């Protein structure tokens, strides 16, 4: 399973 | 033996034509196992192999809502990239992002990944220690800092070192009776009567895995110094691969040229020749 990105560039 | 779990995100902006198109796709080794593509009715995470059909239905609901999240998050990385590179809407820019675990001859992370590309060029890259960053230019430098001060690699590190490796072990089990095992190349040499007093000896290799192979032609035992056509290793589709190498030689002199296959699945390096 994937995960939910918690960083944005 | 060594394996991996790798997911590839791709977002493309398309102004005038509505919102950006997001596409996630999973891969156990080189075999693809899942997908998500916003170009859809009511998009959702779907399998891409008969083996993924056996997982708990809670699995899909999770990855559907997670990917919808990331999709919405990649719309933000795109409009933010516009502000940084001082670009402008109207145009099409795309984001790529490969993240995932790599395991060796044991169930323990060998290398982890988390890297972004913008318009066909590296942008940012979690380094091998999983707590430092690499930026390609000065725009990505502004991201590196945001991530460094916050400590945002703590979340990737935690997924990659953990959850990621557990799930590769899960998927290599589920799909153990299908996923390509290391397989040895089957090799032969055809010849093709090429215009003007010289035949084309082509050398083949078929039904192997992994894709990493070496084909070479030698004249009289030593390195070649004419030329040879060499097409890149290519997917058969059944999970194995295909490459050929072809040198052009004069009629009658075909016995002095030997093809040379080199593959991990061959215990001894192969040497072929016409007939």
């Amino acid at each position: 399973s994937e995960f939910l990105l918690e960083k944005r560039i | 033996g060594p394996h991996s779990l790798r997911y590839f995100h791709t977002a493309v902006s398309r102004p005038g034509l509505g919102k950006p198109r997001f596409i996630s796709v999973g891969y156990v080794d080189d075999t693809q196992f899942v997908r998500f593509d916003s170009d859809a009715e009511n998009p959702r995470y779907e399998p891409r192999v008969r083996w993924m059909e056996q997982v708990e239905p809670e699995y899909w609901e999770r990855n559907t809502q997670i990917a919808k999240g990331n999709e919405q998050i990649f719309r933000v990385n795109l409009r933010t990239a516009l502000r940084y590179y001082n670009q402008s809407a109207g145009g099409s820019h795309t984001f790529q992002r490969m993240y995932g675990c790599e395991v060796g001859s044991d169930w323990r992370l060998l290398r982890g990944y988390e890297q972004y590309a913008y318009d066909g060029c590296d942008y940012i890259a979690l380094n091998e220690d999983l707590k430092t960053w690499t930026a390609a230019d000065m725009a990505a430098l502004i991201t590196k800092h945001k991530w460094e001060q916050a400590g945002d690699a703590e979340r990737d590190r935690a997924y990659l070192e953990g959850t990621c490796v557990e799930w590769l072990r899960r998927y290599l089990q589920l799909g153990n009776a299908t996923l390509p095992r290391t397989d040895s190349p089957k090799a032969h040499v055809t010849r093709h009567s090429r215009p003007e007093d010289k035949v084309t000896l082509r050398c083949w290799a078929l039904g192997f895995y992994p894709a990493d192979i070496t084909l070479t032609w030698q004249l009289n035992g030593e390195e070649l110094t004419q030329d040879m056509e060499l097409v890149e290793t290519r997917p058969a589709g059944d999970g194995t691969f295909q490459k050929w190498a072809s040198v052009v030689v004069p009629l009658g002199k075909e016995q002095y040229y030997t093809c040379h296959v080199y593959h991990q699945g061959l215990p001894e390096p192969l040497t072929l020749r016409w007939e």
Partner: protein, 99 residues
């Protein structure tokens, strides 16, 4: 920053003339993702061409593998046309059983 498609048409199993098989079309090293891939037969399209989902490699270069069931007879020529914004001239690779 645009990059150009690299087409490669080939059979999956050794093409014995008369026996069912699978034709492949392998467009690589291109950018951006937006591409059309239609496989052909004497000029007219094949109605069920299955395509691989938009993925890429280590160096970021995109990848698609379109495929379809075909039976290679005496002649009836097969092919792969490819539309892209990397080139306003659609490249047309034809199939060759020797390659």
């Amino acid at each position: 920053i645009q990059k150009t498609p690299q087409i490669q048409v080939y059979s999956r199993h050794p093409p014995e003339n008369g026996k069912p098989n699978i034709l492949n079309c392998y467009v690589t090293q291109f950018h951006p993702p937006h591409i059309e891939i239609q496989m052909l037969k004497n000029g007219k399209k094949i109605p069920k061409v299955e395509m691989s989902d938009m993925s890429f490699s280590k160096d970021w270069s995109f990848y698609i593998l379109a495929h379809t069931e075909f039976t290679p007879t005496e002649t009836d020529t097969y092919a792969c046309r490819v539309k892209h914004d990397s080139m306003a001239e659609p490249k047309t690779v034809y199939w060759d059983r020797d390659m």
